[PDB]
Design a protein around this motif. Sequence first.
Motif, mmCIF file in Angstrom:
data_model
loop_
_atom_site.group_PDB
_atom_site.id
_atom_site.type_symbol
_atom_site.label_atom_id
_atom_site.label_comp_id
_atom_site.label_asym_id
_atom_site.label_seq_id
_atom_site.Cartn_x
_atom_site.Cartn_y
_atom_site.Cartn_z
ATOM 1 N N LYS A 1 67.481 47.797 87.672
ATOM 2 C CA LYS A 1 66.806 46.665 87.013
ATOM 3 C C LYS A 1 65.610 46.906 86.074
ATOM 4 N N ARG B 1 67.307 40.153 92.582
ATOM 5 C CA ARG B 1 68.365 39.694 91.676
ATOM 6 C C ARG B 1 68.074 38.337 91.027
ATOM 7 N N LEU B 2 68.867 38.042 90.005
ATOM 8 C CA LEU B 2 68.775 36.824 89.207
ATOM 9 C C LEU B 2 68.947 35.536 90.035
ATOM 10 N N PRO B 3 68.826 34.382 89.361
ATOM 11 C CA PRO B 3 68.874 33.035 89.971
ATOM 12 C C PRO B 3 70.207 32.602 90.561
ATOM 13 N N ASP C 1 67.604 38.012 77.448
ATOM 14 C CA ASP C 1 67.753 37.755 78.878
ATOM 15 C C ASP C 1 66.567 36.920 79.329
ATOM 16 N N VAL D 1 65.952 35.757 82.027
ATOM 17 C CA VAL D 1 65.583 36.023 83.438
ATOM 18 C C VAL D 1 64.105 36.404 83.476
ATOM 19 N N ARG D 2 63.810 37.687 83.320
ATOM 20 C CA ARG D 2 62.422 38.087 83.186
ATOM 21 C C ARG D 2 62.208 38.025 81.700
ATOM 22 N N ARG E 1 67.037 26.773 75.079
ATOM 23 C CA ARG E 1 67.950 27.349 76.044
ATOM 24 C C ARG E 1 69.404 27.165 75.609
#
Lengths: 97, 113, 113, 225, 345, 93
Positions: free
Chosen positions: C74, C111-113, D42, D44-45, E99
Amino acid sequence: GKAQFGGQRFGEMEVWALEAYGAAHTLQEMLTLKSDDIEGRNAAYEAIIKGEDVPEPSVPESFRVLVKELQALALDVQTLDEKDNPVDIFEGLASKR
Amino acid sequence: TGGVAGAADITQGLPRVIELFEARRPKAKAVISEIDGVVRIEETEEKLSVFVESEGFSKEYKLPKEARLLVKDGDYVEAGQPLTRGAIDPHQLLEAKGPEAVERYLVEEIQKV
Amino acid sequence: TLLDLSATELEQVLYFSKYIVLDPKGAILNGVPVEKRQLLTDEEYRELRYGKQETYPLPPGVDALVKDGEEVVKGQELAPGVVSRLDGVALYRFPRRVRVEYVKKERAGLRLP
Amino acid sequence: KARVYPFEDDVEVSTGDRVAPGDVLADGGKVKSDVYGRVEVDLVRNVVRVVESYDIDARMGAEAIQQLLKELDLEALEKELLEEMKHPSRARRAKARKRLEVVRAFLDSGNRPEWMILEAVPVLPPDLRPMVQVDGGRFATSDLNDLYRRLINRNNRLKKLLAQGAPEIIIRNEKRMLQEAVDALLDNGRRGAPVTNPGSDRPLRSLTDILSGKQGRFRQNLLGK
Amino acid sequence: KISTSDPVRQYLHEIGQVPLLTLEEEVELARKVEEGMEAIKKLSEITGLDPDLIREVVRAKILGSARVRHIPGLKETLDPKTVEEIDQKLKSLPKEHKRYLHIAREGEAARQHLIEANLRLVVSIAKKYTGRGLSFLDLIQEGNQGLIRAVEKFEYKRRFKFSTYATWWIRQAINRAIADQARTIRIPVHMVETINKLSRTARQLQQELGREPTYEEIAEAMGPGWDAKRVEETLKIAQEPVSLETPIGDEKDSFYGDFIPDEHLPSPVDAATQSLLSEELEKALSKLSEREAMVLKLRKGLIDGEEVGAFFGVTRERIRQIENKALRKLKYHESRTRKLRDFLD
Amino acid sequence: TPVAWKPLLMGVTKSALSTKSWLSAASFQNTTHVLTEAAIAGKKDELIGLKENVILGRLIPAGTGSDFVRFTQVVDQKTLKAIEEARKEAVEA
Ligand SMILES: [Mg+2]
Ligand SMILES: [Mg+2]
Ligand SMILES: [Mg+2]
Ligand SMILES: [Mg+2]
Ligand SMILES: [Mg+2]
Ligand SMILES: [Mg+2]
Ligand SMILES: [Mg+2]
Ligand SMILES: [Mg+2]
Ligand SMILES: [Mg+2]
Ligand SMILES: [Mg+2]
Ligand SMILES: [Mg+2]
Ligand SMILES: [Mg+2]
Ligand SMILES: [Mg+2]
Ligand SMILES: [Mg+2]
Ligand SMILES: [Mg+2]
Ligand SMILES: [Mg+2]
Ligand SMILES: [Mg+2]
Ligand SMILES: [Mg+2]
Ligand SMILES: [Mg+2]
Ligand SMILES: [Mg+2]
Ligand SMILES: [Mg+2]
Ligand SMILES: [Mg+2]
Ligand SMILES: [Mg+2]
Ligand SMILES: [Mg+2]
Ligand SMILES: [Mg+2]
Ligand SMILES: [Mg+2]
Ligand SMILES: [Mg+2]
Ligand SMILES: [Mg+2]
Ligand SMILES: [Mg+2]
Ligand SMILES: [Mg+2]
Ligand SMILES: [Mg+2]
Ligand SMILES: [Mg+2]
Ligand SMILES: [Mg+2]
Ligand SMILES: [Mg+2]
Ligand SMILES: [Mg+2]
Ligand SMILES: [Mg+2]
Ligand SMILES: [Mg+2]
Ligand SMILES: [Mg+2]
Ligand SMILES: [Mg+2]
Ligand SMILES: [Mg+2]
Ligand SMILES: [Mg+2]
Ligand SMILES: [Mg+2]
Ligand SMILES: [Mg+2]
Ligand SMILES: [Mg+2]
Ligand SMILES: [Mg+2]
Ligand SMILES: [Mg+2]
Ligand SMILES: [Mg+2]
Ligand SMILES: [Mg+2]
Ligand SMILES: [Mg+2]
Ligand SMILES: [Mg+2]
Ligand SMILES: [Mg+2]
Ligand SMILES: [Mg+2]
Ligand SMILES: [Mg+2]
Ligand SMILES: [Mg+2]
Ligand SMILES: [Mg+2]
Ligand SMILES: [Mg+2]
Ligand SMILES: [Mg+2]
Ligand SMILES: [Mg+2]
Ligand SMILES: [Mg+2]
Ligand SMILES: [Mg+2]
Ligand SMILES: [Mg+2]
Ligand SMILES: [Mg+2]
Ligand SMILES: [Mg+2]
Ligand SMILES: [Mg+2]
Ligand SMILES: [Mg+2]
Ligand SMILES: [Mg+2]
Ligand SMILES: [Mg+2]
Ligand SMILES: [Mg+2]
Ligand SMILES: [Mg+2]
Ligand SMILES: [Mg+2]
Ligand SMILES: [Mg+2]
Ligand SMILES: [Mg+2]
Ligand SMILES: [Mg+2]
Ligand SMILES: [Mg+2]
Ligand SMILES: [Mg+2]
Ligand SMILES: [Mg+2]
Ligand SMILES: [Mg+2]
Ligand SMILES: [Mg+2]
Ligand SMILES: [Mg+2]
Ligand SMILES: [Mg+2]
Ligand SMILES: [Mg+2]
Ligand SMILES: [Mg+2]
Ligand SMILES: [Mg+2]
C-alpha cells in the motif's frame, strides 16, 4: 448480332496505312464520326440525310471514356488552350449543377 | 540467334534484324579496336592476345580459343575495326569510332540481311 | 523516395499495420532521444504512453501471498526485484510504487472503504 | 510515482494537486504536469498517481504520412540534396540524385506533393458501371461496383465505429480493410487480388485494369474501333 | 503482409496479455461502466448540459486528443477551447459532484477495457457465420459493433454474465449485416429467411425424387401461400448478378459488356426522324389556329397527356369543335400533300 | 554553362519506351508507371506525332493536317474584284 451486320474493325495496321497517306480526315472519321463520336455520328447521319456535307468531328467517346477512367484514379487530365488555359471536351455536362 | 554449342559464330535472318534495331550483345561478339595503331600477336597455350599500339600506347586484348582472328601481326587497325571475326556491339562501336560510325554500321549491317 | 523513409519497407510497415513513426516530438526515451522520424513497435510503444512496466501477478491462495504482498504493497515504495515471499516467489522486478486489490479471509487492516 | 500531499506553486499553472481540498489535475486518464505525463486518481488516500511517459506523437497509416508530406519544404530538400549530390562520395550522393529527381519536377512545373495522399475518392460515372437487365431477369453490372460498395461499406462502418466508441484494435483492423479497399478500385492485384463471391476467382477489373489491362483502355484504343 | 493473421495475432495477443477473469474483472468493469452512466446523468443534471455532451467530453479526455475530434466528426466542437470549457465546469463541481466526473472517466476506460477483452468472443462467434457472403474481417467487425451494443444494455444487477449476453447482441448484428450488405441488390431480412427456407426445402425435396423439384413441390412443402409464380420469382432474385466483366466464349479475351446494345440513344435513324417530324409538325402548327391546336399540342406534346381542363376560358363545346375540325382539315390536307402518311413510326 | 553530353545509343524498343509524350508511353510500356511520373511532374504533352494525337481523335499532325497547308483559301477572279470593292467602300465621305 441478329439482323444488323456489325461494323468492320479498323486495326492499328490499318491506321498506319492511312497515317502513311495524307489521309488526315479520313482517319479522324474512322476514329470519330464512324465509331465513337456519340454526338458526331448522330449529327453525321442527319447531315447526310439533309444532303449536308458532313460536319466537323466532335470529341470521341473513346477519349472521354478515357479521361474519366483516368479521373477515376487520382490523376487529373485537363486539355489546354493556345496559351496554357482550359478548353472543353465534355461539352457542358462537367461544370456543376 | 544461334544456340550455345561448340562454336556457333553469327546470327542470320530476322533474329539478327532484332539484334540490330535493338542494340544488343551479339552471340559471338567481335572485340573492336578502341585504339588505332599497329598489331602484335602471342603464342602461349591457353589464350591468344592481340595488341594494338601507336608511338603513344598499346592495349591488350583477350581473344579466347574460339575467336578466329582477322587481323595479322603487322598492320594498322582503325578505331572500332573488327579484331575478332563476326558481329559487333553497336554501343562499343559508338564509343570507339563514334556515332557516325555506329549509325553507318547499323544501317549497312541491317541491309546485309 | 520523396519522404526519406525506408523507401520500400518503412512504408509497408506503418501503412497497412500499426507500426508507428514519431511524427513531431516525443520527449520520453527508449534509451536514446526522441526519434524524429524513426519507427517503433506496439510493445515498446505500449511501455511508453501508460507507464514503463505493467505487472499484475495475483496470488494463488488466500493467506500465503495475500499477506506478503499486502504488508509491503500500500504505501511502501517497492524497489525492483522485490521478492514477495509465498507462492514460489512472487517476483516484482521493476521501479516505483504498488497497488494491490482484494483480500479474502486472514486479517483485515488498512484497506479501502 | 505516487504523490500523497502535493502542494501549490503558481509559476506555471498549478501542477498536480493541493493538500486535500483543490485538485487541479485531470482525472485519471491523460494529464501532463512536468516531464512526467499521465495522471491517475485514487480518492482513497489523497493519492495522485502520476505516470512518467510524455506527449509522444505516435501515428500509423496514411494519417502519419499525410502529416510528413505537408511539413516538407521541397526547396530545402532541393538545396540539401544539391550539396549532398556533388560533395560526398558516390554512395549517399547517388541516392540523393535519384531523390532529387522527384522533388524537382514537383517544384518545377505542375502541382505540389501533398495530393498523393487520398482522403477524397473519385467515383467513376454510373452508366460506365451499368446495372442491366439481361435474360430471364439476369442483370449485368461493371465489376467496379462491387469494389465501390466495398469501400463505401467500410468507410461507413468506420464512421459508426468511431462514433459508437472506439476500441483501438478494431478501429485499425477496419482502417486496414478500408485501405486495402481503396487500393481495389484503383488497382487490384498489386497487393492481393479481390474476388466476386464463389463463382469466378477473377480479379474484379480495377480502374487500373481498365486503363492498361490484358485488353484495356489505351490498349484497345489502338487495337481497333 | 496477409491481413487475417495480423489482426488475429493483434487481438489474440492483447487477450493473451489481458483476458478478463471469469467473475472479478468483468464484474469490476461492469460496475464502473454503470457508475459512469449514473455519473454522466447526474453530471447532466447539475450542468444543464446534455448527457450526449457530457459523454463526448469525457470520451475525448480518456480516448483521444483534438486529433480524434477533428478528423472523425468534422467541426462543431472547437478542437481546443470548446471541450476545455466543459472540463472546467466539471472541475468547479465541488467534492460532491467532482466525484462523478472522476468516476465517469474511470468508467469510460473500464468500458473500453471490457470491449477489448471480449474480442475473442466476437471472432469465435463470427467464425461460424463465414460462408454467408461477407468477408471474415467484415463479419468480425459487424459482430464487434454488436458487442459494443451489448455493453450499452447489460445490467450487472441481474447476475448473469456478459458472455451469454454478448452472444445474442453479436449474433443479431452479424445476421443483419449478412442480410443488408451481402448482396449487390439489397434484399430485406424477410426475403432472406424466405430464401433460406426455399433452399432448405429444395434440399429435402432433392432427397428422394431424383428429380430437381418442379416449382410444384417447393410450393407445397413450403406451406400456406406458396405457388409456382412465387418460387420462380424468389429464385430469380436469389441468383446474384453476373460479372459484366466475365470471360466469354473462348475465354481467350472476351468481355461480356461490349455486346449489350443501347436504348435511350437515338440511333441515326431516330435523329433523322425527330428532324423531319419536328420540322413538319412545326410547319403545320404555325398556319393554324393557336386556340385548340396549341392546347392539344402542348397538353399532349409539352407536359402530360382532360378536354375541359385543356382549354383556357372557352368551355368544351369550342374545344371539341376546333379540335376535331382543325385536326381533320390538318389530316385531310396532309392526305393531299402526303408527307405524314408514311408513318414516321 | 557548357552542357557536356555523351552520345547514347539505346534500342528501338527503349527509344520509344521512353519519350517526351506520356500519351505514347502510356500506350505500351507500363501505363501504371508512365502516368505516375508524367503526373507528379505536371507534364504538358505537346501533341506532335500521330500516336498521341490519334487517341485524342484529333486530326493527324502529319498529312493534310500540315501546319503548312491547313490554311489555304481559293478564289474566283469575280470574288477577287468583289473584295477589293469592299476595300474601295472603305473611303469615307
Ligand atoms: Mg448539341
Ligand atoms: Mg457530328
Ligand atoms: Mg444537299
Ligand atoms: Mg450548312
Ligand atoms: Mg465540334
Ligand atoms: Mg486524370
Ligand atoms: Mg542445340
Ligand atoms: Mg549441345
Ligand atoms: Mg563450349
Ligand atoms: Mg550483356
Ligand atoms: Mg604471335
Ligand atoms: Mg602468350
Ligand atoms: Mg579461334
Ligand atoms: Mg586496315
Ligand atoms: Mg569475314
Ligand atoms: Mg563519345
Ligand atoms: Mg570516341
Ligand atoms: Mg572515328
Ligand atoms: Mg563521340
Ligand atoms: Mg563504322
Ligand atoms: Mg531509405
Ligand atoms: Mg536496404
Ligand atoms: Mg531505401
Ligand atoms: Mg506490415
Ligand atoms: Mg527525423
Ligand atoms: Mg502501435
Ligand atoms: Mg520504512
Ligand atoms: Mg525487461
Ligand atoms: Mg477480509
Ligand atoms: Mg509532507
Ligand atoms: Mg518567466
Ligand atoms: Mg534534413
Ligand atoms: Mg554523406
Ligand atoms: Mg541508397
Ligand atoms: Mg498517401
Ligand atoms: Mg424476362
Ligand atoms: Mg464484397
Ligand atoms: Mg493497443
Ligand atoms: Mg494493438
Ligand atoms: Mg488474392
Ligand atoms: Mg481474396
Ligand atoms: Mg472474396
Ligand atoms: Mg462480390
Ligand atoms: Mg470468400
Ligand atoms: Mg493486372
Ligand atoms: Mg493490366
Ligand atoms: Mg447517482
Ligand atoms: Mg444543486
Ligand atoms: Mg461539414
Ligand atoms: Mg451554431
Ligand atoms: Mg487546448
Ligand atoms: Mg495541447
Ligand atoms: Mg451525490
Ligand atoms: Mg463452412
Ligand atoms: Mg452458440
Ligand atoms: Mg433456393
Ligand atoms: Mg434446416
Ligand atoms: Mg436453382
Ligand atoms: Mg460465346
Ligand atoms: Mg444509338
Ligand atoms: Mg424547322
Ligand atoms: Mg401549311
Ligand atoms: Mg404566333
Ligand atoms: Mg398562320
Ligand atoms: Mg405561315
Ligand atoms: Mg393540336
Ligand atoms: Mg398546355
Ligand atoms: Mg403529373
Ligand atoms: Mg387560364
Ligand atoms: Mg361542330
Ligand atoms: Mg359549326
Ligand atoms: Mg377546320
Ligand atoms: Mg393506300
Ligand atoms: Mg517486348
Ligand atoms: Mg523492358
Ligand atoms: Mg503497343
Ligand atoms: Mg499495376
Ligand atoms: Mg517518366
Ligand atoms: Mg481542313
Ligand atoms: Mg474566293
Ligand atoms: Mg457605298
Ligand atoms: Mg471628296
Ligand atoms: Mg465622292
